Design a protein around this ligand. Structure first.
Ligand SMILES: [Zn+2]
Ligand SMILES: [Zn+2]
Length: 69
């Protein structure tokens, strides 16, 4: 029984009958979270950066921080 669909691009798991699609790509509500605090970006206001996606929470801190590294 070969059971393994492509699914999203994050966790690579089939998308339920109520997920989300970004940039013509299969994404999940949990996978569509910032690569920092893992916040639900879907529906909320987020910023897509060439590198990765950051929620208004992290973004603000990134664009406006004391020291990056
Ligand atoms: Zn996923
Ligand atoms: Zn975040």
């Amino acid at each position: 029984g070969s059971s393994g669909s492509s699914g999203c691009v994050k966790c690579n798991k089939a998308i339920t009958s109520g997920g989300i699609t970004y940039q013509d790509q299969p994404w999940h509500a949990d996978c569509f979270v910032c690569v920092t605090c893992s916040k639900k970006l879907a529906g909320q206001r987020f910023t897509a950066v060439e590198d990765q996606y950051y929620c208004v929470d992290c973004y603000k801190n990134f664009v406006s921080g004391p020291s990056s590294g």
